[PDB]
From a paper:
We isolated the c-ring of the FOF1-ATPase of the green pea (Pisum sativum) from a native preparation, crystallized it, and determined its homo-tetradecameric structure at a resolution of 3.4Å. The crystal structure of the c-ring from P. sativum shows a concave barrel shape with a pronounced waist in the middle, exhibiting tetradecameric symmetry consisting of an inner and an outer ring. Each monomer was a hairpin-shaped, 81-residue polypeptide, containing two trans-membrane (TM) helices; TM1 (residues 4–41) composed the inner ring, and TM2 (residues 46–75) formed the outer ring. The proton-binding site retains a chemical coordination similar to that of the alkalophilic cyanobacterium Spirulina platensis, including the same amino acids: Gln28 and Glu61, located on TM1 and TM2, respectively, of the same monomer, and Phe59 and Tyr66, which are positioned on TM2 of an adjacent monomer. The Oε2 part of the carboxyl group of Glu61 generates hydrogen bonds with the Nε2 of Gln28 and the carbonyl group of Phe59 (with distances between relevant atoms of 3.1Å and 2.8Å, respectively). The second oxygen group, Oε1, forms a hydrogen bond with the hydroxyl group of Tyr66 (2.9Å). This chemical coordination represents a locked conformation of the binding site. Glu61 is likely to be protonated in the structure, which was crystallized at pH 4.5, and this notion is supported by a pKa analysis. One contact region consisted of loop-to-loop interactions mediated by yttrium ions, as indicated by strong electron densities. A galactolipid was tentatively modeled into the intercalating electron density, in compliance with the notion that the uncharged heads of the galactolipids enable their penetration through the thylakoid membrane, as was demonstrated in the crystal structure of cyanobacterial photosystem II.
Author numbering:
A (entry chain N), B (entry chain M), C (entry chain L), D (entry chain K), E (entry chain J), F (entry chain I), ...: 3 to 81
I (entry chain F): 3 to 79
The structure:
Amino acid sequence: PLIAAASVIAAGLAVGLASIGPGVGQGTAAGQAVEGIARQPEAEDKIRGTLLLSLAFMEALTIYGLVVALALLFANPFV
Amino acid sequence: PLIAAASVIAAGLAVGLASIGPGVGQGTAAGQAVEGIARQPEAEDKIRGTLLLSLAFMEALTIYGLVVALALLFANPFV
Amino acid sequence: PLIAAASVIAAGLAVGLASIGPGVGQGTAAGQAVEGIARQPEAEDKIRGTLLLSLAFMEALTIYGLVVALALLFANPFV
Amino acid sequence: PLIAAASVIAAGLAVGLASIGPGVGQGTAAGQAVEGIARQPEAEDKIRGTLLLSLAFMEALTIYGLVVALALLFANPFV
Amino acid sequence: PLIAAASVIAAGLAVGLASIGPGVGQGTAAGQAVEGIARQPEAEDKIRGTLLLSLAFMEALTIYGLVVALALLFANPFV
Amino acid sequence: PLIAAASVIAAGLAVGLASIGPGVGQGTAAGQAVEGIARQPEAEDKIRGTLLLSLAFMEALTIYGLVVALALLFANPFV
Amino acid sequence: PLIAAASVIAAGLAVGLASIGPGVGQGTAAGQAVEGIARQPEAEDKIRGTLLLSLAFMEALTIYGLVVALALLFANPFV
Amino acid sequence: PLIAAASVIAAGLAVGLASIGPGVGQGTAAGQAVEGIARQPEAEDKIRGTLLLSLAFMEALTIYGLVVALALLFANPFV
Amino acid sequence: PLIAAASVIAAGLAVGLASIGPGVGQGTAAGQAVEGIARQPEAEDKIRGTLLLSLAFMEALTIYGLVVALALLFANP
Amino acid sequence: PLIAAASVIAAGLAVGLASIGPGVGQGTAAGQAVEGIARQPEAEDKIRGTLLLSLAFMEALTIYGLVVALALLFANPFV
Amino acid sequence: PLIAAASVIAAGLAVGLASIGPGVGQGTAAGQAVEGIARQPEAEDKIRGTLLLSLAFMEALTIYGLVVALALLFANPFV
Amino acid sequence: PLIAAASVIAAGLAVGLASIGPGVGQGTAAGQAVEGIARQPEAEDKIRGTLLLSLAFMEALTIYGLVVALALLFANPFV
Amino acid sequence: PLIAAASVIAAGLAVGLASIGPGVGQGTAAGQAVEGIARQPEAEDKIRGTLLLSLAFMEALTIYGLVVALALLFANPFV
Amino acid sequence: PLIAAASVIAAGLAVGLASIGPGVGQGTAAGQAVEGIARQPEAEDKIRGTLLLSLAFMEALTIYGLVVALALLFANPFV
Ligand code: NA
Ligand code: NA
Ligand code: NA
Ligand code: NA
Ligand code: NA
Ligand code: NA
Ligand code: NA
Ligand code: NA
Ligand code: NA
Ligand code: NA
Ligand code: NA
Ligand code: NA
Ligand code: NA
Ligand code: NA
Ligand SMILES: [Y+3]
Ligand SMILES: [Y+3]
Ligand SMILES: [Y+3]
Ligand SMILES: [Y+3]
Ligand SMILES: [Y+3]
Ligand SMILES: [Y+3]
Ligand SMILES: [Y+3]
Ligand SMILES: [Y+3]
Ligand SMILES: [Y+3]
Ligand SMILES: [Y+3]
């Protein structure tokens, strides 16, 4: 009844809000990672390795909001 | 009844909010990726490769909000 | 009844919010792509190619909010 | 009844919100496109071509909010 | 009844919100267009031409919110 | 009854919101137009001409919110 | 009854919101107009003339919110 | 009854909001007016004259919100 | 009844919001007024005079929100 | 009854909001006042005198919100 | 009854909001106070004295929100 | 009943809000960590070690919002 | 009854909001404190002493929101 | 009943909001701590020690929101 309607919105906002910060975060990090590559091309293969560890780290932040959204939609215990 | 109306809005806000951050994020990253190419054209083929890995990474952030929006509209378990 | 009124607003906000971030994102990227062209005109044909891949990438972000908005208005399963 | 009142507001906010980001986006891009022309007048005919592809790209973002607003007002399936 | 009161507010917010972004956008673009003219007066007649194409482009963004506002007030199909 | 109270607030917010962006926009543009005049006084009569075309352009943005506000207060079709 | 209470708040927010943007706008413009005078005192009588045309332009933005506020309080047609 | 309670809040927000923008605006302008005086003390008597015309201009913005607030509290026509 | 409860909140938000902008405004102006004094100490007595006219000007902005707040609390109505 | 509950919240928000702006304001002013002292230690006793007049000026802004909060809590005329 | 529930939230927001601005304010001031010490270590004992007077000044801003919060919780006259 | 619907939303917002700040935080830190590596490649193995301790530190911030979200969904004491 | 539910949320927002500003504040201060140490390592033991006095000062700001939150949860007089 | 539903949301927002500021704060501090290490690798072991004291200090800010969230969920006195 109500719970079915409630968990369904919490599934929308969980993934809706989660992408706000990291969406911005990965942006500055990647862009600033590129500018450095442009400045020092010889450091490229060395540079991405950090940007990669970095991008994955922030990508996990929106994953938690994605997982809880699905645990709300599919694996919901309360309905 | 109510759930049908609730999941339908959560489908709107999920994809509505998801695009906010990465929309900004990809912007700074790409633009800053271009400026570097302008500075060092010889590094172009080397530069995009990072911008590409970067753009895809952030593009996945709005995908989660797109997928949940569809799982709300079409594949909805609660209706 | 209610669902018809609910899905109709979720169609408005889906496309309303989707344009916020990428609208800003494409702005900085394009403008910064132009400044570099002004600095290095000889790199133009090389520059746009990245800005193009970039602009399309962000243009897809508002497409998801456009598609869900239409799937809400026209192809709505819940009404 | 309600749907007629609901779709009518969703038509207002769809075009209301859509203009926020790109309104800002085109601003920075164009202004930054001009500054470069001032710096390098000889690159003008070369510069606008990118700014044009850019401005149209962002102009499409508010079009989606305009189209859905009209599809809400005029060709509204739900009323 | 309700629809008459609903479409009347959607007419207020449509033109209310539409001016936010482009109001800021045209500002930076024009101001930055002027600074460049001050720097290079000889480029003036060449500069405005881009600022003009630019200003009109963003002016169209608030037009969509103006048109829908009027289509809500005067040409309203739902009342 | 209600419509009279509804159109009356939409008249308040239409002109209330419209001034936000352009109020900021004209500010940066004018101020940046002055700084350039200070830098190059000889370009003054050449400079204002662009600032004038610019200021009017943004002044029209708040006019649309002013006109709709009046069309709501005085020329209201719905009351 | 209600309309009297509604138009009375719309009179408060009309003048409340109108001052936000231009309040900021005139600030940057004037301050930046002064800095230029400090840099080039000899350009003073030439500088203010633009700042004056500019300040008045933005002062008109809050006038529209002031006029509608009064047309709501005193000259109200709906009460 | 209601109107007495409504006009009383509109009196609070009218003067509450009015001070937001100009409060910020006068700040940047004055501070930037001072820095210029520090840079060029000999221009002081010449500088304040612009800052004075400027400060008064923005001070009028909060006056409109003050006047309407009082016209709501004391000279209220609707009560 | 209601009006007594309504005017009482409008008294809270009037002084609550009024301090937002000028609180920021005086901050930049004063701080920027100080930096200039540090740069040119000899201009001090000349500098404050403008900062003073400036600070008072912005201080009046929160006064209007203070006065209306009191006219709501005491002199109500 | 209601008034007792209403004046009690207005006492919370009066002091809650009052500290926002000046809290930021004193911050920039003080910090910028110290950087100058670091740059010119010999000007210290001369510098603080302005920072002191400045800090007190902004401290009075939160005092008005503190006084009204207390006049709401203790000296309340309406209960 | 209601007042007990009302004063209890006003106690939460009073101390909740009070820390926003000064929390930011002390941050810039202190950080900028240390950068100057790094630049001129010999001025340290002279520098902190201003930062101390400054930090206390802003610390008093959150005290007013703390005191009113307690006067709401413990010394509450209205319950 | 209600608690089941309440804890379900608190599970959505807990993980929704938690990612906002650190999402931005890790972004600036990582990106700034990369730029330094580009500047000094020889410091890379030395640099990441700090960025790693840093990234984990901020990653724990969204973990608390993830854990409470799950403790709300799965091991919920109140239902 | 209600008070128990009211004081329980005020306990959540008190500690929820309190961390916003100082969380940002300590960030800039510490980071700026580190950059100075990097610039002048010899000043380290001298530098932290100010950063320590500074960090504690801001840490007290979130303590007030923590204490009131607990005084709401545990030592609550109103239930 | 209601308290069980109320304390459950206050548990969500307490950790939801707590991470906003420090999430940003640790970001700037850490990133700025690494840039300095890149500039002066020899200062590394000296640098982290401050960044560590700093990171922990801000990490405690989200701990208070985590603890109260748990004291709301598990150790709740009011249920
Ligand atoms: Na850089
Ligand atoms: Na760059
Ligand atoms: Na640049
Ligand atoms: Na530039
Ligand atoms: Na420039
Ligand atoms: Na400039
Ligand atoms: Na300047
Ligand atoms: Na300056
Ligand atoms: Na400066
Ligand atoms: Na400075
Ligand atoms: Na500096
Ligand atoms: Na840098
Ligand atoms: Na610096
Ligand atoms: Na730096
Ligand atoms: Y190289
Ligand atoms: Y070249
Ligand atoms: Y040239
Ligand atoms: Y000169
Ligand atoms: Y001179
Ligand atoms: Y000197
Ligand atoms: Y000296
Ligand atoms: Y009692
Ligand atoms: Y090196
Ligand atoms: Y009891």
